[PDB]
Design an enzyme around this catalytic site. Structure first.
Site, PDB file in Angstrom:
ATOM      1  N   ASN A 107       0.824  -1.197   0.000  1.00  0.00           N
ATOM      2  CA  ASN A 107       0.000   0.000   0.000  1.00  0.00           C
ATOM      3  C   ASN A 107       0.865   1.256   0.000  1.00  0.00           C
ATOM      4  O   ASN A 107       2.081   1.205  -0.196  1.00  0.00           O
ATOM      5  CB  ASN A 107      -0.941  -0.021   1.199  1.00  0.00           C
ATOM      6  CG  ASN A 107      -0.213  -0.235   2.525  1.00  0.00           C
ATOM      7  OD1 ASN A 107       1.012  -0.350   2.579  1.00  0.00           O
ATOM      8  ND2 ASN A 107      -0.978  -0.289   3.605  1.00  0.00           N
ATOM      9  N   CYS A 159       1.139   3.096   2.779  1.00  0.00           N
ATOM     10  CA  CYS A 159       1.774   3.051   4.087  1.00  0.00           C
ATOM     11  C   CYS A 159       2.843   1.969   4.206  1.00  0.00           C
ATOM     12  O   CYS A 159       3.421   1.828   5.290  1.00  0.00           O
ATOM     13  CB  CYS A 159       0.715   2.846   5.173  1.00  0.00           C
ATOM     14  SG  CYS A 159      -0.471   4.200   5.324  1.00  0.00           S
ATOM     15  N   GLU A 166       3.013  -1.265   4.391  1.00  0.00           N
ATOM     16  CA  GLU A 166       2.909  -2.199   5.501  1.00  0.00           C
ATOM     17  C   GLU A 166       2.132  -3.468   5.189  1.00  0.00           C
ATOM     18  O   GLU A 166       2.522  -4.541   5.654  1.00  0.00           O
ATOM     19  CB  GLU A 166       2.290  -1.473   6.690  1.00  0.00           C
ATOM     20  CG  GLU A 166       1.002  -0.756   6.362  1.00  0.00           C
ATOM     21  CD  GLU A 166       0.370  -0.127   7.575  1.00  0.00           C
ATOM     22  OE1 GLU A 166       0.895  -0.332   8.686  1.00  0.00           O
ATOM     23  OE2 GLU A 166      -0.643   0.586   7.413  1.00  0.00           O
TER      24      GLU A 166
END
Ligand code: DTP
Ligand code: DTP
Ligand code: DTP
Ligand code: DTP
Lengths: 673, 673
Positions: A366, A368, A370
């Site tokens: 993604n 982020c 993660e």
């Protein structure tokens, strides 16, 4: 034009009183802030009943779930919330909440929800039926023992809810249309949306009739860069591709007018074979993947590079291109020395520990950096033609304080409540424009739990950040975290009797994930560490065996449980540090407007000045070993951020990179200097 | 620049809907006003305790009497106040209270005291010890059954009497002391009015040399400059004086530069002898009063004009001056046709009904033209020389609604509470710069009670203002008022056993005031009037005889009880009419700023349009007879205001004047056109 009283008091801390800071003034500034700006803009009410009635009749609260109890039980919940007599510890501890997150009015000039209000509304939303469970959520949240994620904490009971979307783009004109459609649909919902361009044909190639007709990846990047400017994510790419150089020439300080992306980040996927070729100083061969699609029928990164690389070299059908891997890593080091872009994922470290590789292998991540889950691509046909629905990834988030958990030892019950909370959130979620996200969010039921406040607690207790004792501490802690997590997932799986699909295909049904825990006990190896967990039970490997048997009875409800996000924007409300990355500076300084807001780190006293180290003055190798010790229990990635200096060296940078590849760190982040 | 919502709704009432007014919109405007301006500027608090603690530590409340109870009893009082769920009936009913009277903050931009707050603070101030009596004061005030006077309602428990009456003895030192005391009381904001009876006139000898006195005009000039220095009163004069023409040339539309008083009003004292001389068309003789002081030793208006006028004519010692009384009343009619100035007091109507004429006779009145009590002049000697202290008049005020009294029939208990309230107020009062006011306020203990809302209640019930039935109604009502008033005064006199000084010199000890009530019973002479008082006890003349015996047992605590003031500034909070003067216009119109506030009279419906008559269209003679019927029970004056038109005649004006003198009206007010 005069600066108000509390800001002037907050600027007093930099005055050297006996070579120190005016910490004791800070509370006074906070005690100013609740007199001269907050308590003179709250809309005044007699009591609870009319208050809620006024809140209904002006289109603020969704009246359905707030009609599913008695008035008296809600009164008891609000009474339990106000019975704390809660206070804030710092100056930003109010300012980041009563400026942006808490609810304002229609003219955006007055304040309705107090700090008890928002929490207890979230509590009744997580309740869905039981008053005492809502009181348990109150006792969980009001002691700052748990923090839900940002959009859930914002948009509970108002006028979507998950800030993380992951898609795939199949190769057609219709697919690109559908992709830009879904990106503009989710763009108004405010979440994080990132794409991936694996299965696309490259530049200068045949489009079905005529050779040398494809404008390539850069035009699709140009369309997406214009697309997110209308309503901001990123995109990833596997490295075995000819246009990868042009994929890396976008982030350039000598930016072209056309080749100019100020919106999307980029990132590189690298398996072990390219690492091997860059080590042993030989050639490399990037491909034309549409030729592979014509030859083998499948797509490129759906097969092992280690098994098929020299076989594609041996095929006369696959047109190839020879390049230098070592100069390419040098160019990567140069571009990261420019900013820190792009992102990096080492998929072979991920898949060799991944439980659910029987569905697919993880190819991307993604925004982020993660969430690393399976992903099946769809196929969007013509208008009257029906489509085929793949699988997508949508991960709601949430972390917790380590400190109050250590204060109260209620870590089990904490996980018990937070699991049900995120479960009910993923129950509630529905999107009515992207059908594959709909099908996957019904199917996979992936929740994400993490933690902040690693640096500050262990620094306040008087343990250095580079100590091995902290590594053993985190090992035992996250071991017990994952233990109770799987325990609660098995409990809920027994409660419903309905695991996720293809559960027998997982390694969880076979206990292959459990084979690490049947031996190699994680007992504390230090006395001072053992005194911290002293006063509560710690399980054994036979308890893991009983856990394995209880899993083999029914199974597990969830397919994914854990995530670690840089939750800085809701770090300030919990009045703590970031997550596992140590702090940059001891004092943060901001300028709101005509102002110098001075934020001290929490726990800043004279004694613990040394344990509050600086991020530019640390051993990166011990940090990577800390993160690898943390990695021993986490299914997904960990928000690992590099902290660099201008005096450092790209030689040392690439050494750290290969060191993390040798340890098994999954992904990294943008680097700071 | 846009007009806000509630003012726009308040301007809607003048729209003709079927030839009517939009009354029902008005509440909506009020319901707007409590949403968009009031409940968004109240300082917000959790609960009572911290609230009061914050109110103490910023120098708002006098902490002494607010320390003389428990916290819980104060909580019960505030709970009883909020248990009413009180609302306002009109638009000005909020606007005149949350703009000026209610408590603001230090920056004058936020609001602290709510409408329960001010009332219950006044309640605990009137309590001084009993919780249940404070609850009785709450139940009295929150039903709008009683209204204390303006400065008491303002300055309770913050950082008190608006009526001062003095005398000026004749020396240089006395004028110095007078200007001193006027500047002292000027910062206290009360009403201060003087009197210039015993001064020598213009062109007279000052102790060595004839024709040396600049006269009354210079002292008026000094006082007019004197009140311009601080945050405005008046002065009176008995008519038998040479400079009376110059006393009346001040209020002049062709104003001289020196003869120019924009601050002080003036007023004339007239006994029956001058009225007789003006009727019978003969000469008149004004005097030089210092010659009288040299001749008889006393001062001029301390003796009867009817007994001594021709004796002063017969004396060769008293230098005199012959004038025309009829042309003087013509000049008075002309000057009242200009504005309405000056004021007029007919002292012989006053003293012939006054109880306490054994101390002195009333010579003058206050600014509010109502209080008529005894007054002994002091004598302010030189510096090391001691002075001699006379007597002064200081009257605190307070009225009540007639309407809610008629609703609840608790008129006795109402007077019981209000008497103790004003008693405790006169207990509390102390001034530390004017010693004669100090001595008199300790001595005489004069309280003042009245009533508003005469016109509106009887107009809403459907009885005309000029009806004889209303005169009989007011007769019976004020009879019972005075009955219970003297009853409570006798009760408190029995409670303390300490009447005021020289009580045996009064007519109250002899029952000469009671001789009216031993016969001539005031039973209602109409059935419709009798239905209004139906449902409660009305006393008899034998009850007056028992009252006379109970007075003869002990006595009365007070020397004065009643007053009638034009309490318009606190008429609006009670949401009612004025006092006994009928209303001027059916709709009041004001411009606050860029606005047209439209106030309807309360009770304005289609049916009672005729009973809401207009003040320019009434019989003045029936009004005077109404006021004379009211005068049958009141010790002091009554705030009688003339309502005139430009089409009227000074012939008719002076006819009304002599008519009121023939009836026995004590004083009048400035006339309106
Ligand atoms: N840090 C804070 N967090 C929350 N509210 C605060 C904070 N600081 C001040 N206030 C609030 C609470 C009160 O409404 C008001 C200040 O009162 P406060 O003195 O803090 O509480 P308190 O009544 O418990 O202490 P004290 O009895 O000494 O007055 O503003
Ligand atoms: N006019 C165009 N300009 C640029 N690219 C195009 C154009 N038309 C199609 N493409 C690109 C994007 C598409 O993903 C890819 C193939 O297009 P498309 O016709 O949709 O594939 P297809 O499903 O019909 O069959 P095939 O697999 O043989 O390409 O080439
Ligand atoms: N005339 C008024 N006097 C006093 N307060 C008022 C008045 N009008 C409105 N308000 C106040 C009371 C409330 O705090 C708020 C408006 O609520 P309001 O509707 O008047 O009371 P309520 O709750 O008894 O009626 P309802 O149940 O229909 O809402 O402002
Ligand atoms: N210089 C002055 N100019 C104008 N008026 C004065 C002056 N001095 C005194 N007076 C006026 C005001 C006084 O009230 C009045 C008498 O003055 P004052 O000397 O104080 O009286 P007195 O008490 O000494 O004796 P007497 O009764 O004979 O006047 O005349």
């Amino acid at each position: 034009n005069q600066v108000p009283k509390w800001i002037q008091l907050n600027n007093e801390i930099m005055i050297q009183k006996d070579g120190k800071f005016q910490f004791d003034k800070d509370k006074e500034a906070v005690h100013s802030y609740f007199v001269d700006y907050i308590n003179q803009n709250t809309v005044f009410f007699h009591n609870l009943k009319e208050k809620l009635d006024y809140l209904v009749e002006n289109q603020y609260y969704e009246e359905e779930f707030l009609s599913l109890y008695s008035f008296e039980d809600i009164k008891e919940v609000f009474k339990t919330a106000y019975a704390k007599k809660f206070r804030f510890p710092s100056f930003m501890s109010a300012f980041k909440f009563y400026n942006d997150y808490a609810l304002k009015t229609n003219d955006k000039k007055k304040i309705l929800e107090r700090y008890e209000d928002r929490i207890s509304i979230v509590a009744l939303f997580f309740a869905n039926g039981d008053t005492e469970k809502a009181k348990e959520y109150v006792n969980l949240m009001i002691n700052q023992e748990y923090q839900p994620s940002t959009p859930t904490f914002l948009n509970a009971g108002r006028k979507e809810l998950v800030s993380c979307f992951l898609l795939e783009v199949n190769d057609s004109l219709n697919d690109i249309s559908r992709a830009i459609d879904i990106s503009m649909q989710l763009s108004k919902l405010g979440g994080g949306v990132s794409l991936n361009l694996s299965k696309l044909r490259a530049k200068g190639e045949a489009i079905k009739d005529v050779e040398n007709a494809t404008k390539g990846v850069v035009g699709v990047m140009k369309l997406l860069d214009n697309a997110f400017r209308y309503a901001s994510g990123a995109a990833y790419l596997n490295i075995f591709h000819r246009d990868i150089n042009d994929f890396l020439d976008t982030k350039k300080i000598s930016a072209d007018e056309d080749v100019r992306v100020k919106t999307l980040s980029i990132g590189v996927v690298i398996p072990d074979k390219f690492v091997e070729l860059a080590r042993e100083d030989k050639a490399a061969y990037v491909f034309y993947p549409h030729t592979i699609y014509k030859e083998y029928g499948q797509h490129m990164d759906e097969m092992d590079m280690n098994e098929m690389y020299d076989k594609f070299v041996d095929n006369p059908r696959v047109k190839k291109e020879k390049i230098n891997p070592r100069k390419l890593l040098e160019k990567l080091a140069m571009l990261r020395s420019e900013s820190g872009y792009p992102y990096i994922m080492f998929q072979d470290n991920v898949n060799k520990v991944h439980a659910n590789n029987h569905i697919s292998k993880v190819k991307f991540s993604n925004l982020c950096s993660e969430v690393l889950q399976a992903s099946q691509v769809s196929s969007y046909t013509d208008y009257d033609e029906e489509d085929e629905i793949g699988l997508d990834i949508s991960c709601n988030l949430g972390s917790l304080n380590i400190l109050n958990v250590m204060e109260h030892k209620s870590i089990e019950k904490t996980v018990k409540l937070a699991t049900d909370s995120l479960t009910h959130v993923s129950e509630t979620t529905d999107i009515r424009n992207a059908p594959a996200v709909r099908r996957a969010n019904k199917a996979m039921k992936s929740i994400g739990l993490g933690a902040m406040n690693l640096h500050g607690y262990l620094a306040q207790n008087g343990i250095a950040y580079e100590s091995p004792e902290a590594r053993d501490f985190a090992n035992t802690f996250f071991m017990m975290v994952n233990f109770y997590s799987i325990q609660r997932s098995a409990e809920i799986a027994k409660e419903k009797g309905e695991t996720f699909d293809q559960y027998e295909g997982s390694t969880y049904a076979t206990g292959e994930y459990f084979d690490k825990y049947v031996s190699t006990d994680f007992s504390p190896k230090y006395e001072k560490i053992a005194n911290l967990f002293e006063g509560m039970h710690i399980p054994t490997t036979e308890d893991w065996k009983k856990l394995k048997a209880f899993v083999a009875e029914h199974g597990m409800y969830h397919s994914y449980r854990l995530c670690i996000a840089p939750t800085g924007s809701i770090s300030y409300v919990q009045s703590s540090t970031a997550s596992v990355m140590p702090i940059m500076e001891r004092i943060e300084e901001r300028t709101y407007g005509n102002s110098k807001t001075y934020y001290p780190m929490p726990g800043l006293a004279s004694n613990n000045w040394f344990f509050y180290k600086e991020a530019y003055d640390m051993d990166m190798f011990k940090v990577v070993d800390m993160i690898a010790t943390i990695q021993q229990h986490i299914d997904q990635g960990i928000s690992f951020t590099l902290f660099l200096k201008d005096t450092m060296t790209t030689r040392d940078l690439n050494r750290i990179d290969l060191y993390a590849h040798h340890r098994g760190i999954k992904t990294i982040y943008y680097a700071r200097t």
